Amino acid sequence: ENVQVLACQSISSDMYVILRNEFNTFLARISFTKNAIDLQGEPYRAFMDMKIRYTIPSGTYNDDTFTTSIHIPTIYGANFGRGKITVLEPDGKITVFEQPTAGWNSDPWLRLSGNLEGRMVYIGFNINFVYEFSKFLIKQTADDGSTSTEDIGRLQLRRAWVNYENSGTFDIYVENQSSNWKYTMAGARLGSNTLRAGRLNLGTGQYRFPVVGNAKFNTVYILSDETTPLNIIGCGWEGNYLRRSSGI
Amino acid sequence: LNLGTGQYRFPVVGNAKFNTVYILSDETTPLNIIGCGWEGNYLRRSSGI
Amino acid sequence: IKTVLTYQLDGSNRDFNIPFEYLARKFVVVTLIGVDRKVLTINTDYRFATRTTISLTKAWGPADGYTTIELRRVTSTTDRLVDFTDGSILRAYDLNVAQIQTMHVAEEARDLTTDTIGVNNDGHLDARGRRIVN
Amino acid sequence: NVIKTVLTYQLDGSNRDFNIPFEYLARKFVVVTLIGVDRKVLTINTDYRFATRTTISLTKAWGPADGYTTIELRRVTSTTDRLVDFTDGSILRAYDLNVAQIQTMHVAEEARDLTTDTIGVNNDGHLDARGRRIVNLANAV
Amino acid sequence: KTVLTYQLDGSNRDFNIPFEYLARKFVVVTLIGVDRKVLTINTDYRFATRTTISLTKAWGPADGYTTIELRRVTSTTDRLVDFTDGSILRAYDLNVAQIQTMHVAEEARDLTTDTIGVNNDGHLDARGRRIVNLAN
Amino acid sequence: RSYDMNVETAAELSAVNDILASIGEPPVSTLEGDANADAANARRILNKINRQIQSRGWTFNIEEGITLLPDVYSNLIVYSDDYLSLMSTSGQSIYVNRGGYVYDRTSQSDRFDSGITVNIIRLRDYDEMPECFRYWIVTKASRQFNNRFFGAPEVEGVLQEEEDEARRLCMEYEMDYGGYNMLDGDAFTSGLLTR
Amino acid sequence: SYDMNVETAAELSAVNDILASIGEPPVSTLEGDANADAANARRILNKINRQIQSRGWTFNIEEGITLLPDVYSNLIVYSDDYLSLMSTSGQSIYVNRGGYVYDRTSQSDRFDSGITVNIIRLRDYDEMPECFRYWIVTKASRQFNNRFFGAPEVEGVLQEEEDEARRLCMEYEMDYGGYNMLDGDAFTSGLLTR
Amino acid sequence: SYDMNVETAAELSAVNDILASIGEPPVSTLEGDANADAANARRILNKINRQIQSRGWTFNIEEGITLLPDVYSNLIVYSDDYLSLMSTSGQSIYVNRGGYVYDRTSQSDRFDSGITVNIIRLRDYDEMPECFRYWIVTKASRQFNNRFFGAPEVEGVLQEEEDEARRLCMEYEMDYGGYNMLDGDAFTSGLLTR
Amino acid sequence: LISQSIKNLKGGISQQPDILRYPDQGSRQVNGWSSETEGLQKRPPLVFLNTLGDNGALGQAPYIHLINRDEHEQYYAVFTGSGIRVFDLSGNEKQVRY
Amino acid sequence: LISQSIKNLKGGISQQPDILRYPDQGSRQVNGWSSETEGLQKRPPLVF
């Protein structure tokens, strides 16, 4: 929200970014590594901004409130203005903390539920991915490369599909003028060799979701703030098309 | 300000050759025109070529 | 806290508010106790004006012979709201609804005390009217 | 109210088939008892068989004669041992989640069974002692 | 066994709890007394081990507060598990998700035995009490 | 896996699955929540057709002699939307609804003292219906949800035949169930056969 | 013509079903948000509501009701809610001239003491038998499917539904009216007197 | 509705035949592995199993069986396994209101001592004559071929098979019931007494 | 009944009208990486290396240049506008004498 | 019944005969700015 970005400069396949907060400035790294776990011992690459791996200090746990609390300034060296912070344990456990209303600078502490004192928690903010889709008109390529869309008829749309591969926790929102429906693809299908209790739920497939209405007024966006990855290969749609005036 | 997006369908009736359409605005507000369509009965008797 | 609540019936009040977090809606039942238990149907007599109020159409009262509108929530053990099916994404909304529904059934199980014989001052068991039978 | 997991069907003579409506999760979780002067729980194959998925056929037919006025078929889902329990690497199958969720619902419906046990209201505005003796009970004042 | 009274004579801090609980906030401790009093946790009772609570001071029969009656009140709204989109599922997660409901049900089925209830013989035992307000 | 398991399912939920099987898409797990459109549309077309199949009077539906009763204070009897039909017991029904209250058209009175007796078609749910009809409420909803959304002509043309077979079976259900008699059970020619 | 400036939950489920007819998602309120399709649907529902009532039906035709002239004016308002005024016996004599009932035969717009007329009056969609409430929708489900989304294959199925709905509606009064050939009419009831 | 949470080898060969109907390879177990097609096939088999039993057939219709009310409740559970309750003679009076048998005529859900009803109850696919076991498959082999793999030419052959199967099924009880016109019925058996 | 499929989602935001956009293009794409092999993914996550002091430490508008001279001599140099603060890529300040 | 749509209005005045003009071109365009993203707009205003 408030991160002023100083000039990043890629070195190899790694991009070194400098940010402002505006409490403290930082140097961070983005590396496009397909298959790596960005930090050591992390269960899966967790697409969380500002990942840090923190071994909890001993003094934090208090028996009376049964919580272990870690100060944000201690973990990163800086206080942060806004955002949701996910603390991922070595096991899959994820605890997400929404910003205190004032900010994370008013009250820094992250009150983890159990007694964790020697655990290593990978803590970071959540990256928000948003991809609106262009309206689903009938786009027909001409003999030449340029594509022209038929807007001279009513296309009433009935279904749509998103083909994905190895992705998770994404939400596709279809909004007509007054409707706002949300459809969530949450992972591997039940019974797949992929869905297992302790492993990440990452699945490949086609999710067919219903988009209903005039194409011109329907909007679909895919939004994911989760720690897991995302892939979108293709997108289809079907629907009744009826242009009365048989053109050309 | 009343600024809107849409398609305004208006009736132009008659032989295409003799109909003229002009858009004129002297108002303080902006204007955008993206595309323009038309429909109409077409009947060429002499099936050409 | 609390699934089963009863109101008082006077002739002109028709709107009564529902405290519990009902899942569905078929789950709230509204029975006019009065002298004789009488169950109200979903739209002919009572109607859910807001998520949180049940507004009677007839505005019953003691003049009809009925007092003490009893509107209790009975979660359905058989009509499950989530049925997992092979080949369907395990959405988290499903697991949470399953857990919520079973915990609602148990929460209403905790209210049978309001239901039973009852203990008066002292240990005296009590039966207010309610002749014991069988 | 009403109680949907305890059903007591009258016993007359040779009716040796009674039906189990409640959805029971396993054949050992239904207990058939021949209530009368002395409750007698019946064993799974010596006495009662399960003719169909939803019918129990007693082997002998017991009537009002041997004592045994009524038969109660009720559900006892074991709260202790979970029928399916997940483990770390298990493939999650729509059967496992379903059997798990179905068992907890069954345990809470056993709270209506608890209403059946204590003295509680029946269909009429009558506290029901459901065919059992009020033991102890003090005196009159 | 959600309820069991621990009548102890002196300032005895240790009272073992046999009802396995999900969290500290579920076990509520009251002293049976002329007046029942809900002892708060941090200030009055502390969990020495999960199994054993340990009270500070412990009151007494000499005090008005008498015996101590600890019990399980497992909350029915504050769900311990919130399944979210992965967020790897955890085996510990599903099993606890079902254990909370089993606990609520099991401790709710003891809110009946405190009344008439049923003996092994199959008979509804009033505990030598007098049934008032009955009709013939 | 144990053979010894009798477990049930939502007859309402399994009906919405059968609708979404018909148009061609995977089974939707839970109907809850107004987000999924397909569930809401498939559930509404189920409900909107449930009130038609029932409205056509069938022998079980038509309660006879049901006495509606007036409010003591205002003496007006409410006509709900659950009363699919309200008609007089004998002939020339005199009841109509004016402003949501039963009105006697002949006497022009919205005020009834002491009650009216009528044949009400009550609206009841998919789960109180005979299986014969529970099939047909779905497979008629399986046509209009195929009509209004998945407009492929070849599978509506297949499904039409099915809705018709279902009507035939549903009809057969009451001609047995009502058990109607020409010459021994009616109003007119039962009286003529008296010796 | 009475116009639509009020809303009803039972009427709202009808406009949802007319928007189902194209393949459009349901509206949630008929507020006035720029949903051209919903507006058009409300128009076609009302515009067809005034046919189904116009075709006379037994509960619709109030019979023998008296319209009263305003005393000082001496004329009766013949409003647009009165779909068919008619007359009770034969050769109906009342016609609308201006907005007031006029005796076609006696050339007078002035009446003292009223008229016994058989009037079919507009009733709300909600105030309608369920049999017709379906058919007013599924007839509006045709013309709304013909005027904006003109696909032929989703219409040709719908026309076969409108007709079934009409059959069911017609069946509804032939029970409800209870019309008797030889025991209940005006002519051949009188012939059967012994 | 009873739902499918158990398996049977004789039932497994039916789902193989419904997957043959598209052109899909046979499954080996109905474990729950993500085979959408097999799951859908199990759904259509069960969903059509509850028609073929619903149409009454002679062995299906238990005749004159007594349903016993639970003694304390005084009502009888009318479960979803009872496809058609009916009644033994005429004008069946029992209807399902809530989940319990209700006497439509006497407005009572309370019964003492039971009822003689003619009930068609659900029986497993396996508990079915072989003539029907074919036809439950080859009717499911149509709707599964219409809902997921909508090819018209492999359906139009299948519809000609469903009908043959029905003929063979119908032939099965007209032997099995052994129904007699003039010597076995209720009316014209009594007329032939000398 | 017509259907179309956008084979890939490679194009990004396009502000051209919707009737003119090519099939791949879309209205908004935030925090996404359109690779050729898998069409759209979430950007790779930032990994924290070090904090480089307060907000004003580097100044309102620094000119920052990366000196990639060698594998071991990769340094960043920021010009505060009041001075030079050089940082190793691990975030370690390297003293700049003037 | 035939219909055609001029996708964009990018071309300006053309004095060629109407039977020869391309679809985009038009007879008069005064005080207008034919941008690619939004086809025709009013010129930006003069500021004194």
From Swiss-Prot, chain D:
Domain of life of the source: Viruses
Record localization: Virion
Family membership: Belongs to the Teseptimavirus fiber family.
Subunit: Homotrimer. Interacts with tail components gp11 and gp12.
Record's function text: Structural component of the short non-contractile tail. The tail comprises six fibers made of gp17 trimers, 2 nm in diameter and 32 nm in length. May attach to host lipopolysaccharides (LPS) to mediate primary attachment to the host cell.
Name this protein carries in UniProt: Tail fiber protein
Organism: Escherichia phage T7 (Bacteriophage T7)
Span of the entire protein shown here: 3 to 143 of 553
Swiss-Prot record, chain E:
Presence of the UniProt keyword S-adenosyl-L-methionine in the record: no
Cellular compartments per GO CC: virus tail, fiber
UniProt keyword annotation of Transmembrane helix present: no
Alphabetical keyword list: Host-virus interaction, Late protein, Viral attachment to host adhesion receptor, Viral attachment to host cell, Viral tail fiber protein, Viral tail protein, Virion, Virus entry into host cell
Subcellular location, record wording: Virion
Domain of life: Viruses
Assembly with partners or alone: Homotrimer. Interacts with tail components gp11 and gp12.
UniProt record similarity statement: Belongs to the Teseptimavirus fiber family.
Biological function: Structural component of the short non-contractile tail. The tail comprises six fibers made of gp17 trimers, 2 nm in diameter and 32 nm in length. May attach to host lipopolysaccharides (LPS) to mediate primary attachment to the host cell.
Protein name as annotated: Tail fiber protein
Source species of the chain: Escherichia phage T7 (Bacteriophage T7)
Shown residues within the full chain: 6 to 141 of 553
From Swiss-Prot, chain F:
Keywords of the record: Viral genome ejection through host cell envelope, Viral penetration into host cytoplasm, Viral short tail ejection system, Viral tail protein, Viral tail tube protein, Virion, Virus entry into host cell
Pfam families: Tube
Provenance organism: Escherichia phage T7
Keyword Cytoplasm: no
Protein name: Tail tubular protein gp11
Annotated GO CC locations: virus tail, tube
Superkingdom of source: Viruses
Residue ranges that the Swiss-Prot or TrEMBL entry lists as coiled coil: none
Swiss-Prot record, chain I:
Signal peptide: none
Transmembrane stretches, start-end: none
Subcellular location: Virion
Function: Structural component of the short non-contractile tail. The tail complex is involved in viral genome delivery. Forms the end of the tail, including the canonical tube, the nozzle, and the small extensions below the fibers. Once the tail tubular structure is formed, the interface between gp11 and gp12 generates the proper environment to interact with the six gp17 trimers.
Subunit structure as annotated in this protein's UniProt entry: Interacts with head-to-tail connector protein gp8, the tail component gp11, and the fiber protein gp17.
Name recorded for this polypeptide: Tail tubular protein gp12
Organism (species): Escherichia phage T7
Region of the whole protein represented: 3 to 100 of 794
